[model samples]
Target: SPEIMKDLSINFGKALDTCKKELDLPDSINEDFYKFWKEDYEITNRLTGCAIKCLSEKLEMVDADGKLHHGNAREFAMKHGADDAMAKQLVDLIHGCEKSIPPNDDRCMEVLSIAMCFKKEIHNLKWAPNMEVVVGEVLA
Candidate 1:
């Protein structure tokens, strides 16, 4: 339900914050080179782990083995010009999440973000751009 989703995006996201109090950093905008700021993938991993655990416990979006049910997941993303290979990659990654909960921080974040896209797409499933910005860069 919308409420459940709201719970994650807001509450979970807030819980993920506070590193701002912890890390001395600067604003890195992305209008051009994006002047890449080096992120500690370590903290990112810990936060993502927390989120995956949170979502894992709360989200009923599980397969027979606790992975995401991919038929609808695949159906949504690929039809949206999200590339067949990438679609398969997403499905594989999601399914892999069953045995490998909190897979990798980036992997965890990528899935969560992509899942968000599908829930609101044309067929209530089309893969949108964030899928790439967050995950596709690493793929290529």
Candidate 2:
């Protein structure tokens, strides 16, 4: 359900403040960045990708090589309410998205592309939440 994705976003995004402090991003991690679980929203800021990389690292979802750590990634999904199968699926999606991006000098831009691809796939699967439902309940 889309609600599951919403829960995942809300829970995972709790790391943003710490990441922001660590990365010292010029601009804040905007409210929109937290709404990534919603479709029809764009994630254009490269810093958001940096924050994402930080979040993934903090959560131990990514490895030293900066690729998805399948075990931890699956555990993260399960912690956010996905079943075992769904967690595996989520990890696979991330891995697939990671592979889709061509090698780039900038890790932030590379991660951004992967994130964009993952978001597109979630939307295609009808798994992204509606903004209205999320904003009132969570983002507010």
Candidate 3:
């Protein structure tokens, strides 16, 4: 049972490391921050492969004019069970960023904001079911 014990030990150690890092964050920092970060990371890590496939399939189903034959982005996302508020938040953020930034700097800061938004959405998911996925897809 030594091999099994070693495996458990390693897994437990990693978990503890994550917990410790999380705990070391400043108490003054809002709880929502960490919640979104963890949730977004989890969703991105777990669902991105499946999501990308789903998105690609849906994109292929669109007409030549970019009009969706069956469903638009929002409709497609809704079919997959995304939360409405979360989706709106992501769309708003992207729209805001696009309007505010110049083309040259747009790529850098916009992408960062996009990632940050995903992290924020993930953090929000502790209290909100599937919100992160819903909003993340809208933003993507």
Candidate 4:
């Protein structure tokens, strides 16, 4: 069981990294936001992974057709450890968007807003050439 857990953990980490890389964040952003976003993603991933584990554990309790008498992972997480208020905030933010950005978008925006809000925090950091241009394109 420990080995299975370890494998799941490693897979979770890789999935988080993949999510970040897909975001293609520019080098101009403060490092602190990058670290924070990555950790947030990992936690969310772990929550989903735990949901899968929960479903697997309850398989026998379901009918032969794999129909669950209980709610799914999304519901289970909210009922258990997921922060209800934060989840509501997210839902409100994207209530009108055409194509809803992935959950990680909030984390990325939080980091970027913090970095931009506090210029001094990253004043000494070196940015790649055209960093501003790239960031502008991303925002556009």
Candidate 5:
């Protein structure tokens, strides 16, 4: 459901903010990436992918091999209120997107491409959340 994705997105986005210094990202990444949910502006910055990797690791969604950890990811989704099926679908979507993208040596760019693919897939399913509500709850 959109609610599950929305909740997880905002929660993770908020968590991402606290790791800005550790990630060495500019101040605009949160704003820019957050805005990407609703706006059409470019999100080509490597920092965006850096942030995503950091967040995924922090949530234990990525393995030591720098790949998605299905169990941990499913737990993360269930923790944020996703049912088993929804969580499974989420993991499958991510894995599917990762395999669909051409490999890149630049880890940041590779993750960025995967992320863009994931984002596009979500939009195709009409699961991208309403950014206004997400930002509002995030700031509150």
Candidate 6:
């Protein structure tokens, strides 16, 4: 069960990354207003939020014992050096996006791509010359 769960989690992340590459969507979100949402604030978080929801849902459902074999987004975030609040914010964002998008769409994949990229890109504290890291979001 642990092994299977790990594969699913990794695949969800991998799919998001793949879509980002195939679609040529840059890491930055422009002011592509659909619902008149705040372009800079909303797009990045929506993308990141969806990715968090997808992977987090797969991480594990709590058993009667109340523990998981796989790590959730908060745990992953913490392990990778996020404050508890940082992880909690992403989780909150995920729930909001989940409420917004209620059904299946291929565009979900694109959202996922941006989401995963955003997360990896955002947490990078020591990016340096020629060291490949996902470029984080910017208001520009």
Candidate 6 TM-score over all chains jointly: 0.33
Candidate 6 C-alpha lDDT tens digits along 1-140: 22322232343444444444454444542222121122123344454444333433454422233222223756765555546776565455444443454344554444444443333433342221121112211122
* Ranked candidates, highest TM-score first: 5, 2, 6, 1, 3, 4
Worst 10 residues of 6 by lDDT: 128-137
Give the Cα lDDT of each candidate.
0.37, 0.75, 0.34, 0.29, 0.75, 0.38
> What pairs collide in candidate 2?
none
- lDDT of each residue in 48-105, candidate 3, tens digit only: 3222223333344234642233334344434434457544543454345434544333
Residue pairs with colliding backbones in model 3 are 35-123, 36-122, 36-123, 40-122
The number of clashing residue pairs in model 3 is 4
Which residue pairs in model 6 clash with each other? none
Instruction: For candidate 5, write residues 1-140 as lDDT tens digits.
Output: 67877888876766655567687678777665657566344468888888777777778878888778999989888999988998989899999987898898787777778777877777778888875433444434
- lDDT by residue for model 2 (1-140), tens: 68788777766667666787899975554655746655667777888879877877888987878788998878878887999989988888989998887777687878778888888888888888755332343333
TM-score of each: 0.31, 0.85, 0.29, 0.20, 0.87, 0.33
Tens-digit per-residue lDDT, 1-140, candidate 1: 23222322333233222322334222221111111111211123333333433443343344565447666555544444445675576567555444453343464465444433333331232322221122212212
lDDT of 4 by residue, 58-87 (tens): 423133443222233234324433356533
In the order shown, the candidates' Cα RMSDs to the true structure are 12.0, 2.7, 15.4, 16.2, 2.2, 11.8
Best by TM-score: 5
